[PDB]
Design an enzyme around this catalytic site. Structure first.
Site, mmCIF file in Angstrom:
data_model
loop_
_atom_site.group_PDB
_atom_site.id
_atom_site.type_symbol
_atom_site.label_atom_id
_atom_site.label_comp_id
_atom_site.label_asym_id
_atom_site.label_seq_id
_atom_site.Cartn_x
_atom_site.Cartn_y
_atom_site.Cartn_z
ATOM 1 N N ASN A 214 32.916 75.663 43.721
ATOM 2 C CA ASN A 214 31.850 76.274 44.498
ATOM 3 C C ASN A 214 30.582 75.418 44.494
ATOM 4 O O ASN A 214 30.344 74.653 43.553
ATOM 5 C CB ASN A 214 31.560 77.699 43.990
ATOM 6 N N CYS B 230 24.678 80.228 34.042
ATOM 7 C CA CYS B 230 23.318 79.737 34.267
ATOM 8 C C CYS B 230 22.200 80.736 33.895
ATOM 9 O O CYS B 230 21.171 80.314 33.387
ATOM 10 C CB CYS B 230 23.140 79.212 35.688
ATOM 11 N N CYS C 55 23.317 76.174 42.147
ATOM 12 C CA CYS C 55 24.235 75.944 41.045
ATOM 13 C C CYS C 55 25.667 75.718 41.531
ATOM 14 O O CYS C 55 26.017 76.024 42.670
ATOM 15 C CB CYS C 55 24.166 77.077 40.023
ATOM 16 N N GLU D 111 39.135 90.555 34.351
ATOM 17 C CA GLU D 111 39.875 90.407 35.618
ATOM 18 C C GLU D 111 40.735 91.621 35.969
ATOM 19 O O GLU D 111 40.909 92.526 35.157
ATOM 20 C CB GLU D 111 40.759 89.146 35.606
ATOM 21 N N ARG E 124 44.143 82.631 37.027
ATOM 22 C CA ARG E 124 43.345 83.853 36.961
ATOM 23 C C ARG E 124 43.192 84.332 35.516
ATOM 24 O O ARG E 124 43.875 85.253 35.070
ATOM 25 C CB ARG E 124 43.995 84.932 37.825
ATOM 26 N N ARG F 280 40.918 76.205 36.835
ATOM 27 C CA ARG F 280 41.211 76.184 38.273
ATOM 28 C C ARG F 280 41.606 74.806 38.787
ATOM 29 O O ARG F 280 42.519 74.700 39.587
ATOM 30 C CB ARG F 280 40.037 76.735 39.082
ATOM 31 N N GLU G 65 40.759 79.461 44.957
ATOM 32 C CA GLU G 65 39.364 79.019 44.879
ATOM 33 C C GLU G 65 39.233 78.239 43.581
ATOM 34 O O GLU G 65 39.556 78.765 42.507
ATOM 35 C CB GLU G 65 38.412 80.227 44.907
ATOM 36 N N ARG H 7 35.307 87.262 31.756
ATOM 37 C CA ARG H 7 35.290 88.191 32.870
ATOM 38 C C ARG H 7 36.499 89.096 32.747
ATOM 39 O O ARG H 7 37.597 88.641 32.443
ATOM 40 C CB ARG H 7 35.295 87.438 34.205
ATOM 41 N N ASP I 124 32.810 77.582 49.332
ATOM 42 C CA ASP I 124 33.999 77.631 48.480
ATOM 43 C C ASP I 124 34.998 76.534 48.799
ATOM 44 O O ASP I 124 35.234 76.219 49.964
ATOM 45 C CB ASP I 124 34.703 78.982 48.623
ATOM 46 N N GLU J 239 28.701 74.091 34.025
ATOM 47 C CA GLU J 239 27.732 74.739 34.901
ATOM 48 C C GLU J 239 26.569 73.804 35.199
ATOM 49 O O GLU J 239 25.925 73.271 34.285
ATOM 50 C CB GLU J 239 27.236 76.047 34.288
HETATM 51 ZN ZN ZN Z 1 25.293 79.289 38.364
#
Ligand code: ZN
Ligand code: CL
Ligand code: CL
Ligand code: PT
Ligand code: ZN
Lengths: 477, 487
Positions: free
Chosen positions: A410, A296, A436, A328, A337, A443, A407, A326, A391, A345
């Protein structure tokens, strides 16, 4: 904690063109007047800033607490003297902050900090600061940084909101392993990276269809396309520039397009069949930022420096134009993962009330999807008033009856963080909030396939109707 | 001038080769007409010029042409000595050490000073270039002198013939059309709230109106091309590593155009505290210090888009039943460091492509290409109703480019490239080592749909007002969404 008073001490002299001699009377009385009037404004009773003493130069010692701080009171004094001396008739010697703390702290490799000494009640800082730094509010930021370090020494709080009734778990394989053996996907060349064959792609695409039709459309979200290379400008403005560094993949443009500059590199490869990564690093420019991390932040460049008409809020948009990245924790994982993931998003902006309302509405939709379409076992929790993340977690049977839940969803209420960060006002003048929600496709798949298996015959009816006939994979010898 | 190699080297020995000065000297003199003649036309062939011994050293000077090169010549004299001194003398060799490796390369011109891995110095002389090399035994077995020779010859023959690289032949062109709209479409879109520039170079954020157009194009490609031709969706990686580009051939020269990716040297927060603290006090991100702290690049951002897919089939064998493999990706952005100056969406550093890939026999790959043109023709003529042409760029290995005019550029401005079909031959099966069960040669092709490019052409030709767009296109778009208005 500690009750030691937050104290600022300033010793400096004002640059005077004329010699302070006929002013001697005028300057003394108007410092007194500053102590009862000028330095009171913006402070509770009695807690105002104070000039303790004053002596070519007009040198002074100045004291404050947290309100009307020494470095902003001196500019209040600079303007009052200007009208008093000019019409009729800053060089810092020391800057000391005293900050409350329980525990001892290390010496910091931080700019503008000359010395750090531990005292009774907390820490004493000596600042290497001139006029410009004070105007720039540097001591406020050093204080903020130090306060962040202090309370971190005093060191999760997790709070359950709703949980589904446990169901039977006939499938106990690791879906990633299962997917590999059955030809759904393969590991990509980079770490935490996957290539998805037709069957896996189909699942991803079906979740996407679900989000669109069951959530985004019924709630009136409009598709936009957010940038994926993200610059320091964005991360400064979003706050990610305060700490995101360990997790991101950095991006460097070439210093020049010039063939000749790059000839040594191509040459090296031709001769050795090895890429000269060392030499390439020399020739690439400094990093401009990194790959999409939160997704975002770069959108907020669309509204940065703008005033929204009240007519236009709530602004409800989403993006599904590319990949996030990312760095990790090391060691290999499955799709639960990853380092390269695919997220839808979802961003909404409006008043405080509108943001809470939008969050609640998304929560209802997620509940419908997870219960009625995917038919999975899940729960949701709040991480420790309405600012914060909720979460969604799900059990992965292969991890055993005692394994960590995953997870997989969100919803975040962000307060005024982003509007303030990117400078987005509302025409009526009320404070803008935002929220957001990121749908991580890897996931959802990890959760759904760990619970339901890779066999369409055992999937919930509601899911089967949306997938269609599964495609075949690419069979090898 | 003539091409010649020059070696100065000695063989290491366990015991001293001293009790064999006559058996060894008679052997070298024989090789100048026997051992070092095979594999080369007569007259040409390796020769030993100098002879010298020691208590361990057996140093020699060798000269040759491109036939029976000095480093191959030393491997002929290595096993010849290993059996002449084997059990008859008890002395075996221990390795080869080189003092000098000198090559004379013919060149009519003078050539610039290049830094090259195993070249310890190069100089221009009477007839071309001299190369002093920094090679041991390992480097000779690996063909290092050969690849260096190859490199310099490529540069010598490029300098002589120039850079002839523009083969353009028109195939088909639509009849000219009335162009009522002559505004730069991205300048219009900016003025009408369709999009704004992103923070990064050649980068855009698309408001709902523009996003709708992109998604309408994507929908058309799916419905009118991918589904009826039986393409299957996959998801290709977007961070691309060196290993992938090494196998695709990009590691040979994409360097000027790529956005490089570097991981942090470590995840450890203590390593990054100094960066974070600096930012929080100054409000300046220390990019110079961050550059020191990040690692050497592992690759770049997605450039061509199909290469990372090939790791899915790399080293595999495909049953004949499985071909053609018809596949497509639309999972994210591509990035490219474009030639400078600000542009609109017609030339961006971040773009959105649908990458279509097909693999099969030569014949199937031509067939699949032919199937796509027919679908593109139908789309461009009967849905987008745009003025376009196509042209071959260089038998059947090459690209067919689609170009369209941008009325705002003038009656003789540059047409915009907006669509391609490439036939890549066996390049990708070979580079990624992918085979067919029957053993017949695999070929591949690809086609990238650039959404920014389609938008530029369509919008420049038809305007931003839906009332003027073709009926076919308007029906697919549906109702335009409204933008986000600012005060
Ligand atoms: Zn966001
Ligand atoms: Cl981000
Ligand atoms: Cl690529
Ligand atoms: Pt040998
Ligand atoms: Zn391609």
């Amino acid at each position: 904690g500690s009750h030691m008073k937050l104290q600022f001490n300033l010793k400096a002299y004002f640059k005077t063109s004329a010699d302070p001699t006929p002013a001697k009377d005028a300057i003394a009385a108007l410092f007194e007047e500053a102590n009862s009037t000028l330095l009171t404004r913006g402070a509770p009773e009695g807690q105002g800033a104070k000039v303790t003493e004053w002596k070519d130069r007009i040198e002074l010692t100045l004291q404050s607490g947290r309100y009307v701080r020494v470095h902003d009171a001196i500019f209040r004094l600079r303007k009052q003297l200007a009208e008093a001396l000019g019409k009729k008739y800053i060089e810092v010697e020391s800057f000391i902050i005293k900050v409350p703390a329980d525990h001892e702290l290390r010496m910091l490799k931080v700019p503008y900090i000359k010395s750090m000494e531990n005292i009774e009640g907390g820490i004493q800082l000596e600042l290497e600061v001139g006029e410009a730094e004070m105007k720039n509010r540097v001591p406020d930021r050093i204080l903020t940084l130090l306060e962040e370090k202090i309370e971190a020494a005093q060191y999760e709080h997790w709070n359950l909101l709703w949980q589904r009734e446990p169901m039977e778990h006939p499938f106990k394989e690791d879906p990633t392993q299962a997917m590999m053996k059955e030809g759904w996907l393969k590991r990509g060349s980079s770490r935490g990276q996957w290539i998805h064959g037709p069957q896996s792609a189909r699942i991803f695409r079906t979740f996407e269809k679900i989000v669109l039709e069951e959530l985004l459309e019924p709630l009136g979200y409009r598709e936009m396309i957010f940038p994926k290379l993200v610059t320091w400008e964005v991360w400064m403005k979003s706050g990610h520039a305060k700490g995101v560094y360990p997790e991101i993949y950095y991006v460097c443009p070439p210093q020049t397009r010039d063939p000749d500059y790059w000839e040594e590199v191509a040459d090296y490869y031709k001769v050795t069949h090895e890429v000269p990564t060392k030499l390439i690093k020399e020739k690439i420019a400094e990093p401009i930022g990194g790959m999409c991390y939160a997704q975002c932040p770069p959108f907020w460049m669309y509204v940065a420096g703008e005033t929204l008409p009240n007519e236009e809020i709530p602004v409800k948009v989403f993006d599904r134009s590319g990949t996030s990245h990312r760095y990790e924790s090391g060691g290999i994982h499955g799709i639960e993962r990853v380092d390269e993931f695919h997220r839808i998003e979802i961003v909404w902006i409006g008043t405080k009330e509108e943001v809470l309302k939008c969050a609640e509405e998304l929560h209802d939709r997620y509940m419908h999807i997870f219960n009625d379409i995917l038919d999975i076992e899940w729960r949701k929790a709040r991480v420790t008033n309405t600012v914060g993340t909720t979460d969604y977690e799900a059990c992965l049977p292969y991890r055993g009856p005692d394994g960590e839940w995953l997870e997989f969803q969100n919803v975040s209420i962000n307060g005024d963080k982003y509007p303030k960060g990117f400078n987005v006002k509302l025409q009526s003048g009320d404070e803008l909030w935002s929220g957001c929600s990121g749908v991580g496709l890897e996931r959802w798949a990890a959760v759904f396939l760990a619970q339901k298996g890779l066999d369409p015959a055992n999937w919930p009816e509601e899911f089967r109707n949306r997938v269609g006939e599964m495609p075949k994979g690419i069979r090898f010898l």
